[PDB]
Amino acid sequence: FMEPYIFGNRLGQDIIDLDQTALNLQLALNFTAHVAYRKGIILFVSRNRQFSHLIETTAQACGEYAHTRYFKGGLLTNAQLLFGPSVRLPDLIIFLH
Amino acid sequence: PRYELALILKAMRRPETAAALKRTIESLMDRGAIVRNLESLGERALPYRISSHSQQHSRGGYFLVDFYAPTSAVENILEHLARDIDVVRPNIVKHPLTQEVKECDGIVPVPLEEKLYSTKRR
Amino acid sequence: KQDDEPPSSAFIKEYKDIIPNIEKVDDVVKRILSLEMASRKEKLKIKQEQLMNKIVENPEDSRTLEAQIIALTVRIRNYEEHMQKHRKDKAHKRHLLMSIDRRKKLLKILR
Amino acid sequence: SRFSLYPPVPGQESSLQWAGMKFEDVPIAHIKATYNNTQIQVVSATNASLARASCGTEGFRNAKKGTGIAAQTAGIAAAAKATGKGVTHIRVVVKGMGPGRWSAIKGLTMGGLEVISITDNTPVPHXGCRPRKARRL
Amino acid sequence: NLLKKFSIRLRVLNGLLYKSLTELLCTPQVSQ
Amino acid sequence: AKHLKFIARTVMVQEGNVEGAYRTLNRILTTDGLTEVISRRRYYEKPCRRRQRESYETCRRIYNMEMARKINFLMRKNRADPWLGC
Amino acid sequence: IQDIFYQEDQIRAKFFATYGSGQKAFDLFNPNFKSTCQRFVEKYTELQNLGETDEEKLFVETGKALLAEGIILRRVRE
Amino acid sequence: VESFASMLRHSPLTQLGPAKDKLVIGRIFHIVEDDLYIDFGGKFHCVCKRPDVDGEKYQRGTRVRLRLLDLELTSRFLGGTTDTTILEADAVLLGLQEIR
């Protein structure tokens, strides 16, 4: 499902068309701004441990939330049990990985 | 066709060996052959003890005779040479030069996936 | 038997038309390239070529039904000679009966 | 300038001599190690019998006749008869793959004979005689 | 496929198994 | 029987180390497969069983070699944790 | 997926086969880095613009031009 | 504004061609004991061992020389529909780069 976005194969290494990235990134950044404008909750999520501290530092700088640790089963589908009766779930989840 | 004879002869002195190679090559001609070349490979020790005509042999003279003959003559030639008392072991084969070394690009990798499906499925 | 059997002095099909052009060739060289110093397969390529000329209007074409039928008559007569010596060869006995059946099928389409 | 595992080549000249004897002359110790009995015979290089022994001749019987210690005793016994006859160096041709294959060679060493080489002549047919049927147990 | 694929009588079996395993361990057949 | 005696399957004893010579001769006769041949040739193995075994041995080797390859492909990644604490 | 092969690659392949990689080390952090091979391909192109049609002529002439520049090209068959 | 196609054609990584047995300059960014994580400008970093000679010289930020082998270590194993990647590159550390 990624072959649409691949510019080609440079000697075994797939290259990503940066023109499709620019269009898609424009849409994603615009969407992320309107959600933040409306005071929605944004949660950054990644399991890459090299960038765990960077992503937690980014979320703190933005004013948003980060979950870079082991993700518990039911965190979103069973939030009321895990967090409390009136827990407000995120309005947007950004998957850096 | 073109046949390569491999004639192991009894270890003898040159006078008698030359007589053995004249009698042999004459037989090829008597069977309708056209002898092309005669080569010697030297006297040496046999790889094992060959027993011919009620005598055990440990040393023999190796010779090659390149020749042409009809396909029907190959059988008669070997039959006649087997009755000669100075012939340890005659073997006629098709001449190697008539067969030409094939051309190869290299070793093409065969995948392991296609080696286990063969071994199991059949 | 058949009316025509290639002579032993005939050249093989590769050099059949080349040796005549050469001005002078030795008797030995002619004997090496004759049908005497060739396999039975070579003698059959000469039998087939003779039949194609004597029957087919265009002997250059070998894909016509008449040419394919001629190719199978040479094989059939070859297998019959084989089976006269190898009386218990069951693989070639199958080859003989399958060529006969193939010829009959082609003769039907030709008709 | 190194030792060669490969034996000397018969019909050539070599610098290896044992007790003023060439390789072709050193007597031969024929060990037939079967799964029941281990026999031993020592012969001169002209094929003349000098010593003979086996687990049976030592006095072992039935199952004990086919152990490691039984062949060791047979080797020591073969050495003693050979040592009396005038043998110091032996070429060990060990046929068979039984329990006393090695022990018979160890007994010969303990008995005062010096092994210079170890050959193997276990029969291996190249296609031969149909072996007996597998035992159902 | 491959990944999925991968009294008197006891006296006779006890003695013979011993008689055979001793031979397997007297050579490198199992391992060096 | 017709060949020359003492050339085939013959090792030479170095400095009276008669055990070392024997232990090398066994490694030779085993690497060449004579040991397995002599063992199996004691009783008749029927052609149908011979093919089933040789097929199983081939497939077993291929599986072990690939599993060994994977264990060695990740041999380098087994190192101290660079991102300890995160 | 299209294999990405530019026309310079024909020249670059010959350069690596004849001289290997330039003894100077590639610096992939400099966005405008010019390697020994990239200068070879720039000169090879310049000569080809003049109209030389023989590949052998363009390959040996480019080596001479770089030699004048002072670049150390070793024709390492090993 | 230059197009992406132009950027790729003239990119240093495109000029390198095949990365086997090539020479590149890397930078140490992370050190764990005697293991050096070196960025050579590619997608994945490599991990080398601190050489016995001049070990103290290999500190963070130190530019070094490398001989690339693979840009990514990946291999397909029996019963796998995709390649297994360790998210790492292969290179041989040759030594420090002379500042000059």
Next chain:
Amino acid sequence: SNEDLPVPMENPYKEPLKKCVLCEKRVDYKNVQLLSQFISPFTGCIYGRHITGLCGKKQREITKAIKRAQKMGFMPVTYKDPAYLKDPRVCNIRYRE
């Protein structure tokens, strides 16, 4: 459209396939010196293609030449002739530890 777009072509940097030691070399039953390089010094047994390193074609060529030589009184069967023990080592086999 774009001059910088990639051009279809066969891989310039393609690496030549790996040949065997006997690739494009005649294998004759009378060249017992070459034949002896693929048998065992002690038993004389033919080595497999995982030891000789030959391809399928040349492995069969050597096999047919050894058997013909052994059957025609040129080569021994139960060992390697001592006169070829000095020749180079081509087979990946170490009897000594």
Next chain:
Amino acid sequence: QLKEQEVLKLQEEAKNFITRENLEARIEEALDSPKSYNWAVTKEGQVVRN
């Protein structure tokens, strides 16, 4: 052209074929000069004639 050359080569080669007239003389030349078909290859695939 190829077949004409092959015929001409064979005719040139046929000059040196053995016959009843030169049999004894050719036998002695062969005996005087032994031939060797032996040669060996290295791990690099290089012939090593001795």
Next chain:
RNA sequence: UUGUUAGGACCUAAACUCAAUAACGAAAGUAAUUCUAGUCAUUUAUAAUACACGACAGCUAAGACCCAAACUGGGAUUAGAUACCCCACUAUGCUUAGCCAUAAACCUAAAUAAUUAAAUUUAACAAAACUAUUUGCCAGAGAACUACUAGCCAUAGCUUAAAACUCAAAGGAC
């Protein structure tokens, strides 16, 4: 009798390594070497009441006989084994002429030309799925690889193959 024999005879039977190979043949089947003969073009699928073949085992006649070996005999075993184990030996495995036509003869996959998308595990396990074409075959289970009929160097056989009867299951994968 045994061991050894770089002693003689014999040429019975079977073909180590190669073979970690996957070739050939319609299937059965086929791998010691050499030589001879030899596989090949029908567009393709589709055939019996015809023709030709058909592992192993078995019969007929004359040979062969190294070894193996139903069976038979002797020795052990056990509360007793016609068993499993040991020894001896036979039909037989081999050859040359005739017959027998049977295997889980199964890759348990009919033979062909497609496609890899139909937002298709379309039960589950096997071997990803599916379409088109032609023939053969199947229609709950036992009765039944049976009875009878017919064909056949077969004569307890082989192929073809029911009914009464009795039940509400039989059967498959997990």
